[PDB]
Amino acid sequence: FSFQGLQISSFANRSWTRTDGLAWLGELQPYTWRNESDTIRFLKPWSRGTFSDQQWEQLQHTLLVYRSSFTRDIWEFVEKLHVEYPLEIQIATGCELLPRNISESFLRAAFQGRDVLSFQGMSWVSAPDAPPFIQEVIKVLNQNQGTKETVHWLLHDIWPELVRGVLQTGKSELEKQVKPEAWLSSGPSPGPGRLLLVCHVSGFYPKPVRVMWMRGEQEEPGTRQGDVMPNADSTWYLRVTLDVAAGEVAGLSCQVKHSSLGDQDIILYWH
Amino acid sequence: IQRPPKIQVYSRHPPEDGKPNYLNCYVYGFHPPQIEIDLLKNGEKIKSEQSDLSFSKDWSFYLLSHAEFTPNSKDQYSCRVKHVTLEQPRIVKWDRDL
Ligand SMILES: CCCCCCCCCCCCCCCC(=O)N[C@@H](CO[C@H]1O[C@H](CO)[C@H](O)[C@H](O)[C@H]1O)[C@H](O)[C@H](O)CCCCCCCCCCCCCC
Ligand SMILES: *[C@@H]1O[C@H](CO)[C@@H](O[C@@H]2O[C@H](CO)[C@@H](O)[C@H](O)[C@H]2NC(C)=O)[C@H](O)[C@H]1NC(C)=O
Ligand SMILES: *[C@@H]1O[C@H](CO)[C@@H](O)[C@H](O)[C@H]1NC(C)=O
């Protein structure tokens, strides 16, 4: 279960900007930070981790000063470099705990939907093939010792200590297993004398899963995987389809493999 | 720079007429993040909930909008999506079968 802190910043004109934050641990969202709010919100009882109220308050103050400063600082880069409007900036930052004691952290960012810069070891490094001016934004950002120090601390002290504690408090919820329902339906016609067999699987946690159309032990190819799509309760949904002649439909089944079931797959025959 | 929304609609549970359920409309792969997602019963907006906006590895956004509903014989459902890459609001029908 890796940790990802996520920032979405919209600068439309100069009177109107918003910055939103949220954070994922594994598949679950333990934090949100709405523009309207001066404080992060804990979405789960385990969200607070092992951090004390003081550590949380300090981390908050830093981030709140950051958000304010980020806002005005972008606007200055905008006016003093005549960049376009609107602007969408996103930032992703996080880490994961690897075996032994090694932990790798990161902070990359995006301008207009693609990579633009990141943070490597001790300094801001620009991303290959990026708009002309950001090499010059990188110039300024590298002359701000304080911000560079604060980022380093965050990535190397704060995220790892936060994730260790939240991995502990959230263990039972993170590692839980929810069994899927499954059901069959006849879908839109692929042609005269054809059927679209549709197997639906819904309500499994976690996300890795395997759903195939079968004839005995031989997997039917022609099986088209849907995307795995979220439900509101942090479970998932997937539909898997088969374009088959209405004649050859007998003996077909849909088999569902999921970590929650063991070696006891769900099996459904077409009736 | 600019990506259009992909839209999928599906119910939470097997869709049995009469039994309360959840209708899900999943909008993803888009950019800019500004978007509007309405769930419609027979053309009319219904009370729905939206998750926090988020994004994937490649910086494109996604959003889950869900609402309670009770499917039956007559009523038809759909999802309406307005985005800057769509000159007319895009509409996607709920197909119980797919
Ligand atoms: C818990 C879930 C919430 C999710 C939150 C998402 C995580 C986002 C990452 C957090 C970044 C943390 C960095 C904090 C460093 C910081 O405070 N930077 C601030 C604050 O500095 C201010 O206070 C300091 C000390 O108190 C100094 O005195 C400064 O002079 C003063 O200006 C800094 O000034 C400035 O805002 C840095 C901006 C970073 C921008 C890098 C992002 C790349 C965007 C590139 C966009 C391209 C340009 C478009 C025009
Ligand atoms: C900054 O941007 C917002 C739109 O992103 C503008 O707000 C709109 O302004 C019109 C006309 O005044 C209002 O009727 C709308 O209700 C607003 N829409 C939204 C989505 O906010 C705002 O006018 C812009 N301001 C400047 C100074 O350019
Ligand atoms: C969001 O927050 C900022 C800073 O607190 C505020 O000044 C601004 O008006 C807000 N933006 C929007 C779009 O509501």
Numbering used by the authors:
A (entry chain A): 8 to 278
B (entry chain B): 1 to 98
Which of the paper's sentences describe this entry?
CD1 is a family of antigen-presenting molecules that is structurally related to major histocompatibility class I (MHC I) molecules, but binds and presents lipids, glycolipids and lipopeptides, rather than peptides. The overall structure of boCD1d is very similar to that of other CD1 or MHC I molecules, in which the boCD1d heavy chain is organized in 3 domains, α1 and α2 that form the central binding groove and α3, which non-covalently associates with boβ2M. The glycolipids are bound in the hydrophobic binding groove that can further be divided into the two main pockets, A and F. While the A pocket binds the acyl chain of each glycolipid, the F pocket binds the sphingosine, leaving the structurally distinct carbohydrate headgroups exposed above the boCD1d binding groove for immune recognition by cognate T cells. Secondly, the conserved disulfide bond in human and mouse CD1d that anchors the α2-helix to the β-sheet platform (Cys166-Cys102) is absent in boCD1d.
